[PDB]
Ligand binder design. Sequence first.
Ligand SMILES: [Mg+2]
Ligand SMILES: [Mg+2]
Ligand SMILES: [Mg+2]
Ligand SMILES: [Mg+2]
Ligand SMILES: [Mg+2]
Ligand SMILES: [Mg+2]
Ligand SMILES: [Mg+2]
Ligand SMILES: [Mg+2]
Ligand SMILES: [Mg+2]
Ligand SMILES: [Mg+2]
Ligand SMILES: [Mg+2]
Ligand SMILES: [Mg+2]
Ligand SMILES: [Mg+2]
Ligand SMILES: [Mg+2]
Ligand SMILES: [Mg+2]
Ligand SMILES: [Mg+2]
Ligand SMILES: [Mg+2]
Ligand SMILES: [Mg+2]
Ligand SMILES: [Mg+2]
Ligand SMILES: [Mg+2]
Ligand SMILES: [Mg+2]
Ligand SMILES: [Mg+2]
Ligand SMILES: [Mg+2]
Ligand SMILES: [Mg+2]
Ligand SMILES: [Mg+2]
Ligand SMILES: [Mg+2]
Ligand SMILES: [Mg+2]
Ligand SMILES: [Mg+2]
Ligand SMILES: [Mg+2]
Ligand SMILES: [Mg+2]
Ligand SMILES: [Mg+2]
Ligand SMILES: [Mg+2]
Ligand SMILES: [Mg+2]
Ligand SMILES: [Mg+2]
Ligand SMILES: [Mg+2]
Ligand SMILES: [Mg+2]
Ligand SMILES: [Mg+2]
Ligand SMILES: [Mg+2]
Ligand SMILES: [Mg+2]
Ligand SMILES: [Mg+2]
Ligand SMILES: [Mg+2]
Ligand SMILES: [Mg+2]
Ligand SMILES: [Mg+2]
Ligand SMILES: [Mg+2]
Ligand SMILES: [Mg+2]
Ligand SMILES: [Mg+2]
Ligand SMILES: [Mg+2]
Ligand SMILES: [Mg+2]
Ligand SMILES: [Mg+2]
Ligand SMILES: [Mg+2]
Ligand SMILES: [Mg+2]
Ligand SMILES: [Mg+2]
Ligand SMILES: [Mg+2]
Ligand SMILES: [Mg+2]
Ligand SMILES: [Mg+2]
Ligand SMILES: [Mg+2]
Ligand SMILES: [Mg+2]
Lengths: 151, 129, 144
Amino acid sequence: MGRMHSKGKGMSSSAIPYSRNAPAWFKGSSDGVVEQIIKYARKGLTPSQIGVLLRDAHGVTQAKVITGNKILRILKSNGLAPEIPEDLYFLIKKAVSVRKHLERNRKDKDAKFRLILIESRIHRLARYYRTVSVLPPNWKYESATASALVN
Amino acid sequence: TRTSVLADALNAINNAEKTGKRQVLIRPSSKVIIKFLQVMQKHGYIGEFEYIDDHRSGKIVVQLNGRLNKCGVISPRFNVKIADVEKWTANLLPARQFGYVILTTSAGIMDHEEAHRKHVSGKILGFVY
Amino acid sequence: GKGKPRGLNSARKLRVHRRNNRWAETTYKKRLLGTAFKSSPFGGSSHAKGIVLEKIGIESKQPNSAIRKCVRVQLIKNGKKVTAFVPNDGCLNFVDENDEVLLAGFGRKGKAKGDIPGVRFKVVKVSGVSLLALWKEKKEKPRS
RNA sequence: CUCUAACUAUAAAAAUCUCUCUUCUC
RNA sequence: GAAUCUGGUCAAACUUGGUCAUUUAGAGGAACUAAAAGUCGUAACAAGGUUUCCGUAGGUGAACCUGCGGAAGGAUCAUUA
RNA sequence: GGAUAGUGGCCUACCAUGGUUUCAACGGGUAACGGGGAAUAAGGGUUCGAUUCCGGAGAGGGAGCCUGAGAAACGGCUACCACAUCCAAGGAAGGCAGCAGGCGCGCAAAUUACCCAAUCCUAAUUCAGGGAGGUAGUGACAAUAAAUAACGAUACAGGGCCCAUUCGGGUCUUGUAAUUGGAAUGAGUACAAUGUAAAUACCUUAACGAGGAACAACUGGAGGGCAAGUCUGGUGCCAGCAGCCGCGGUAAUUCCAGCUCCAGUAGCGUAUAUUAAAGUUGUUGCAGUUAAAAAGCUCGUAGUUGAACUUUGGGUCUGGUUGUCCGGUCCGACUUUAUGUCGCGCACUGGUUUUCAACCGGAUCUUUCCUUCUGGCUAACCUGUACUCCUUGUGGGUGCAGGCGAACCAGGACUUUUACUUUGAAAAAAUUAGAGUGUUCAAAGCAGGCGAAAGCUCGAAUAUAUUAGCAUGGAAUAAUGGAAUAGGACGUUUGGUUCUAUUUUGUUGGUUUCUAGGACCAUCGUAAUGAUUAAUAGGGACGGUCGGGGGCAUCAGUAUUCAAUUGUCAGAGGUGAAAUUCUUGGAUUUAUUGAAGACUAACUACUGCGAAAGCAUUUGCCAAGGACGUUUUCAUUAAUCAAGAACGAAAGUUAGGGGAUCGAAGAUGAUCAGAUACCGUCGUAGUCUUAACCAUAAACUAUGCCGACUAGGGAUCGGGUGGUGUUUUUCUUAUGACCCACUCGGCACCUUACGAGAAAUCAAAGUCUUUGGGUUCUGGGGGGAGUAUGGUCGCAAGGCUGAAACUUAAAGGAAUUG
Ligand SMILES: [Mg+2]
Ligand SMILES: [Mg+2]
Ligand SMILES: [Mg+2]
Ligand SMILES: [Mg+2]
Ligand SMILES: [Mg+2]
Ligand SMILES: [Mg+2]
Ligand SMILES: [Mg+2]
Ligand SMILES: [Mg+2]
Ligand SMILES: [Mg+2]
Ligand SMILES: [Mg+2]
Ligand SMILES: [Mg+2]
Ligand SMILES: [Mg+2]
Ligand SMILES: [Mg+2]
Ligand SMILES: [Mg+2]
Ligand SMILES: [Mg+2]
Ligand SMILES: [Mg+2]
Ligand SMILES: [Mg+2]
Ligand SMILES: [Mg+2]
Ligand SMILES: [Mg+2]
Ligand SMILES: [Mg+2]
Ligand SMILES: [Mg+2]
Ligand SMILES: [Mg+2]
Ligand SMILES: [Mg+2]
Ligand SMILES: [Mg+2]
Ligand SMILES: [Mg+2]
Ligand SMILES: [Mg+2]
Ligand SMILES: [Mg+2]
Ligand SMILES: [Mg+2]
Ligand SMILES: [Mg+2]
Ligand SMILES: [Mg+2]
Ligand SMILES: [Mg+2]
Ligand SMILES: [Mg+2]
Ligand SMILES: [Mg+2]
Ligand SMILES: [Mg+2]
Ligand SMILES: [Mg+2]
Ligand SMILES: [Mg+2]
Ligand SMILES: [Mg+2]
Ligand SMILES: [Mg+2]
Ligand SMILES: [Mg+2]
Ligand SMILES: [Mg+2]
Ligand SMILES: [Mg+2]
Ligand SMILES: [Mg+2]
Ligand SMILES: [Mg+2]
Ligand SMILES: [Mg+2]
Ligand SMILES: [Mg+2]
Ligand SMILES: [Mg+2]
Ligand SMILES: [Mg+2]
Ligand SMILES: [Mg+2]
Ligand SMILES: [Mg+2]
Ligand SMILES: [Mg+2]
Ligand SMILES: [Mg+2]
Ligand SMILES: [Mg+2]
Ligand SMILES: [Mg+2]
Ligand SMILES: [Mg+2]
Ligand SMILES: [Mg+2]
Ligand SMILES: [Mg+2]
Ligand SMILES: [Mg+2]
């Protein structure tokens, strides 16, 4: 209930079931689930969409329960992990969108403040992904780099 | 954010004792809380507690019997030399005949009398009486 | 829980916070700035000699109606001029004009005492002899 | 043990004041 | 092997300005205290007799007045009458 | 390279452009020499430390140097500057912050004394010398013990009284009286002697030395704080007292005196400084709603802090320490003695497996490792070789090849690193603590004690310093690191490589061997082959939403003020009341309309959104956001934040645009004693905007943010679940709208104290003397004053930062009665 960059106090979340092992009713194969994950990734989908597709259209409760590895971990084992992590990429996309809206109309100050907030969040997440060495130590965020990474 | 979990546990115990209850539900349930309540059980200030596995930090259900009157953490776990134990007991415990400054030595989490018996001392965790 | 930090590695900010707050006191600020040496009529001095310039009395405050018999003295150690008070019934006549007089503190930490306005100094000795010995006729002024 | 109704609506001007305050124990 | 003497070297110190710091006067100016039996008003404390106060701007013997936004520390915690 | 005794930018030559810093560098101040220590004292601390010891520096300020082992010496020289001295005017000689003493300074500090007796030191060395030093002189700096009377016998009295005929003996004692006696003794003098280098002085002691024992004790106070007077006289808000409150105005418990009394007492009073009081510096341990004090809000580097998780159990043996039950040992009641006896329920020393119970360890078994080998050394018997000393008995051995290494060495080998904590070596003496010790006691000192008096002796103990360093045992708490591209760990693997070199073939030079020794490189297998949860912490994806969040562009509404046309006709505005003003050129109203600019009524609420300002007509576009749902994804990415930044009401400032209303200035008409104020009519700047500034508000919930818990009652907004629910109508159903129940989040609200506050009151202002969840900012009585100055921002207005001198005993908060 922290809401890092606002005054919100919500706790809307999801409760992972107690049992780590596979559900009794699931009949699919772990290798088939991994193949499905690989195909979804090759279609050009981020891990969160892969998980949502496996939960909705199929009986996959969660990949770690069925296979034993996580979705991003499974993709990395097969070398399909994107060079920028998904959350940071989405933050980049949001930031470039707000910057476009700003440069198309100057007088909107609220979106300017929101862009400041988004840039602060981008800096924090970049620092985290840099100390873990997911990103190179020279990775940084300025104007026209966000567009290049997004496009 | 939750910085000192044992502080939350002891505060919950204090609040549920002052109101006259006989049970507490401590959520985060670390090692240190388990050892602290185990010492309190050994000295009788607590009843029959319980660890509830969640696969996520677990929880604890504590049974009381009204014998306790105050827990409390010394939140900065000060390095307590063996000479400074008596000063802490004087400043915290209400009388020399009872009370226990629960402190964590290299030989485990122990009451101050037991630590003085082992002739070993470390950091201070809290106080019970 | 409290305004001050409590961590085991927060000695620096606690110490500097105490050091910055200490200036709120008046004794500490006076002691560190050294205001007594620079601005006070005496620099850290309990007593000081001086020369009588003139012989004036000052009226008291509202609830107290009288004229306290003081004396204006120019200090010899540095040249400052201060009013001082001769404490007793018949001691004004004892001190004469243009004689060395040893002034002391007035007992109220360099502030005006009682109903006497704009004075901060007693008179203990005149022309080498003390006022109290003159007032009880134990010694007499040398009249030099 | 059963219910939601009645209603208003005046403003003229008017400054100032000197002393002196005094114990509560079977 | 003395005086003397060539070049350095350590360099005190002198002259000349420059600079800063502390004392140091100084025509005059703007103040603040204390003293409360001066004078002109009576702003505030009650609805202080124009409710009060804050920010900002203008004005005027003086407190103060006015304009625009606030706040109740308001004189209302209240119109499903 | 030079110089140095020697390392060293210590200096030179040539290169490189580096070194420190928000963990405060650099600069400034220090009425700063550092330390051992001193004062103060519940604990934590605050202040001081020029000076008896250790270091450093200096000899008026500066530089330079000879001699030596050692000096940048100064009671050694050279020169300059400052200050000076004798002078025969040519010259010469100076260094007290050494002991004395003087001038000056200032509140502030000693005699031109004796002497090498004692401590030592220098020298050729006992002997000489030493103002080092000791002795005396002055010395109320501080510190120790302590005189100023003690006891009778008498008169004036009081209490326990034999009872109570009034009594009253005083039966039993305790004081008060200029009555009255006998004693003792010093403070002083002083034969002596001791003392001392010689003398004082002290210890001893002749002879004197107490009656008012004049051999005479003061310093402050007597309203309160604060022990002791409402006694006498004097002065009358004078004189004066009074640290503060206060007394003094003709009866002063406070001023000046006399009497009495109180406190300390050879000391007491004042002044400044400082400590405890001060929980008024608050780490322990302060407060911020209104008393002083939460930055207007948000982001954010440094700093501080940061979820849980990685062997917990057991069984045995065994070592100390306890309390156990008693053994031996024995002692208290029995008194000149004891045992038999009365047991303190054993005053010394054991069985301490008597179960007991711990309180600490040590070794052992876990798939349970504690660094392991490589040679020693094999210490030790799983060795079995020759065998058995002795009862046929594994009690017990003489002993040699394997072979036990933690019983220990001394060597290669790898060492995750810390923070923490136990122990020890260390932290000079003096000081503090503290043991022993009759200096006559004590401050002290390190002395002393015991013989028969015939030399015999125990001492000169200990602890602490909390930081830094060194060693050591421990492994909870806190942090870091392994294996994710396997470049991971092991092995008799099996291959190759630079080598290295003991010996060996004499030695020396290479060539290869061999043996043994690190890796660089492949390949071969052994293995459970290697990735903790996904926080009722966070970020992100998705879903339907929700909102007067924000921007741009459009749309409407009546209203206002003008204008056009039209209508009639004396008034219309406005006010407490009037007047200024407009009106038969027909105003005020009357109908249509038109123009402009602003605004968004009623719906509008203890309702919503937003970080705060703030946001209210319709529609479209633009992006953003909270909340909920989620068996989605990453796995600590987080909380608060110095530096830095973004927004920031109104007002105000530059320009360009507009220009309706309302209205700072101004113009007046009233009211008044005045009214250039409030009431009224006009009325510029402004209000409304596009750019650029401004950064302040009672920017208020006067309540910082994040996190946990604690108590009952309803409603309300957004979301989501369920109802065998109700109307809806599209025949039924799906929605929607309600009804009931629950849940999450938000603005809120009622009751209550069982909690907190000085209360008003707060469901947080609670979980705070039973004081510690993390963290930022601010306040230390009022005024001066948010002033001056110095920075910095601004065109300006002004914003941020921001004292002191001085003055004052209160200012202030809440509530109670008038
Ligand atoms: Mg007068
Ligand atoms: Mg020369
Ligand atoms: Mg008048
Ligand atoms: Mg008034
Ligand atoms: Mg009026
Ligand atoms: Mg008026
Ligand atoms: Mg008024
Ligand atoms: Mg100095
Ligand atoms: Mg010193
Ligand atoms: Mg010092
Ligand atoms: Mg000095
Ligand atoms: Mg010295
Ligand atoms: Mg020297
Ligand atoms: Mg000198
Ligand atoms: Mg020599
Ligand atoms: Mg010299
Ligand atoms: Mg000399
Ligand atoms: Mg010398
Ligand atoms: Mg010489
Ligand atoms: Mg001298
Ligand atoms: Mg001397
Ligand atoms: Mg003196
Ligand atoms: Mg003397
Ligand atoms: Mg006497
Ligand atoms: Mg007296
Ligand atoms: Mg007196
Ligand atoms: Mg008197
Ligand atoms: Mg009294
Ligand atoms: Mg009298
Ligand atoms: Mg306070
Ligand atoms: Mg106020
Ligand atoms: Mg205030
Ligand atoms: Mg605030
Ligand atoms: Mg940081
Ligand atoms: Mg932790
Ligand atoms: Mg010592
Ligand atoms: Mg002592
Ligand atoms: Mg080889
Ligand atoms: Mg989570
Ligand atoms: Mg809905
Ligand atoms: Mg108009
Ligand atoms: Mg008309
Ligand atoms: Mg509307
Ligand atoms: Mg709404
Ligand atoms: Mg800041
Ligand atoms: Mg404006
Ligand atoms: Mg304009
Ligand atoms: Mg006007
Ligand atoms: Mg007028
Ligand atoms: Mg007006
Ligand atoms: Mg108008
Ligand atoms: Mg402000
Ligand atoms: Mg404020
Ligand atoms: Mg103040
Ligand atoms: Mg102020
Ligand atoms: Mg300025
Ligand atoms: Mg009040």
